[PDB]
Scaffold this active site. Sequence first.
Site, short mmCIF file in Angstrom:
data_model
loop_
_atom_site.label_atom_id
_atom_site.label_comp_id
_atom_site.label_asym_id
_atom_site.label_seq_id
_atom_site.Cartn_x
_atom_site.Cartn_y
_atom_site.Cartn_z
N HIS A 149 0.82 -1.22 0.00
CA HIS A 149 0.00 0.00 0.00
C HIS A 149 0.86 1.27 0.00
O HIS A 149 0.33 2.34 -0.31
CB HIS A 149 -1.04 0.01 1.15
N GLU B 25 19.84 6.24 8.06
CA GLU B 25 19.23 7.45 8.60
C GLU B 25 18.97 7.31 10.09
O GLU B 25 18.65 6.22 10.56
CB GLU B 25 17.92 7.73 7.85
N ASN C 115 18.44 10.92 12.29
CA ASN C 115 17.69 12.16 12.42
C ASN C 115 17.43 12.65 10.99
O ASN C 115 18.38 13.01 10.30
CB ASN C 115 18.50 13.17 13.24
N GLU D 217 24.10 8.31 5.96
CA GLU D 217 22.98 8.13 5.05
C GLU D 217 23.39 7.70 3.66
O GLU D 217 24.42 8.14 3.13
CB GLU D 217 22.14 9.42 4.95
N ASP E 157 -0.18 -7.44 1.87
CA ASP E 157 0.44 -6.15 1.91
C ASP E 157 1.93 -6.23 2.08
O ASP E 157 2.47 -6.02 3.17
CB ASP E 157 -0.22 -5.32 3.04
N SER F 203 4.28 2.33 8.34
CA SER F 203 3.93 1.19 7.50
C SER F 203 5.00 0.87 6.50
O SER F 203 5.63 1.78 5.99
CB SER F 203 2.63 1.43 6.78
N1 LIG Z 1 -2.95 1.99 14.29
C1 LIG Z 1 -1.76 1.61 13.90
N2 LIG Z 1 -1.00 0.90 14.70
C2 LIG Z 1 -1.28 1.98 12.55
C3 LIG Z 1 -0.19 1.32 11.99
C4 LIG Z 1 0.20 1.55 10.68
C5 LIG Z 1 -0.53 2.46 9.94
N3 LIG Z 1 -0.42 2.88 8.62
C6 LIG Z 1 -1.42 3.78 8.42
C7 LIG Z 1 -1.57 4.47 7.14
N4 LIG Z 1 -2.54 5.35 6.86
N5 LIG Z 1 -2.31 5.72 5.56
C8 LIG Z 1 -1.22 5.11 5.04
C9 LIG Z 1 -0.74 5.37 3.66
C10 LIG Z 1 0.63 5.35 3.37
C11 LIG Z 1 1.07 5.52 2.08
C12 LIG Z 1 0.17 5.72 1.05
C13 LIG Z 1 -1.18 5.75 1.32
C14 LIG Z 1 -1.64 5.58 2.62
C15 LIG Z 1 -0.71 4.30 6.02
O1 LIG Z 1 0.36 3.55 5.89
N6 LIG Z 1 -2.17 3.98 9.50
C16 LIG Z 1 -1.61 3.15 10.48
C17 LIG Z 1 -1.98 2.93 11.80
NA NA Z 2 20.22 12.55 8.64
#
Ligand SMILES: N=C(N)c1ccc2[nH]c(-c3n[nH]c(-c4ccccc4)c3O)nc2c1
Ligand code: NA
Lengths: 50, 234
Positions: free
Chosen positions: B41, B55, B57, B65, B89, B185
């Site tokens: 995703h 990386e 900071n 880096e 995923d 993620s």
């Molecule tokens: N409640 C959690 N522990 C949690 C963990 C990972 C998550 N990942 C996301 C997330 N919300 N939107 C996207 C995303 C990232 C890249 C492109 C499109 C959507 C995400 O990866 N919400 C999240 C919430």
């Molecule tokens: Na850095």
Amino acid sequence: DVTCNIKNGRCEQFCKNVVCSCTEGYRLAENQKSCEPAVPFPCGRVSVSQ
Amino acid sequence: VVGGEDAKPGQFPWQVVLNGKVDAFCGGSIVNEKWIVTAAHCVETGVKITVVAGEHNIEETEHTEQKRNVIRIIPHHNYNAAINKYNHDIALLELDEPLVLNSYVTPICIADKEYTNIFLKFGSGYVSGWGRVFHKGRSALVLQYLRVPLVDRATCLRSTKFTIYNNMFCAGFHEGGRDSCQGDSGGPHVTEVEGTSFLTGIISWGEECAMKGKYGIYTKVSRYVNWIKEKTKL
Ligand SMILES: N=C(N)c1ccc2[nH]c(-c3n[nH]c(-c4ccccc4)c3O)nc2c1
Ligand code: NA
């Protein structure tokens, strides 16, 4: 006596009914149980001082 | 990561950050010098992405880096965002030039299917990333990390109306407060096996970050070991 079902056959990483083995970049130690680096930067190790 | 801690330099040398239209939108892990494993995703739109290894900071140059362009994105063949954005995923990214392995840029170990599952069942993994440090809040400058316990499937199923498939897992705390979040993620969930960390999950999704009664949802890496080893062969 020795089986992978009990304490992983005392292998630090992988066991096969026993013969111990390691993941890539590691070599089986002189004791035939432990895993030691076989390359300068083996996977999954922290080498910077903490 | 909500409720985590600042990682020290080189503490998670397998971690990488992904940048695109928004910097630090997702994380990843080094499989080897030419390949990264992430969530599908994060890269489904097939947009121009850059990976940064070494990386610590994200707003200070530490001279550790290594930035690389992505030349190939391989989502798992069972991933289909038009059916379910968070099922199957997992995706691989090929780097334009190899990383130079050192104490700040090191791969994560990946065991076989059986042992990756055994390590997940130890019940305690480390997650990390530069995602949100509060629900709907600012994202981290210093890499964050957190130890999360595995949650039984029954408790996990009662926590949501969404479908948790058998090759997904729940991790987090009964009372919330600490959890992964948006921006993390694609990042790793690792298990320490006698001082060697193995990849046991991909940070995938969740509802409200760190809310009591909700848990983070992860992809089981054991389900995809043969596909990762095959596609990343050097
Ligand atoms: N409640 C959690 N522990 C949690 C963990 C990972 C998550 N990942 C996301 C997330 N919300 N939107 C996207 C995303 C990232 C890249 C492109 C499109 C959507 C995400 O990866 N919400 C999240 C919430
Ligand atoms: Na850095």
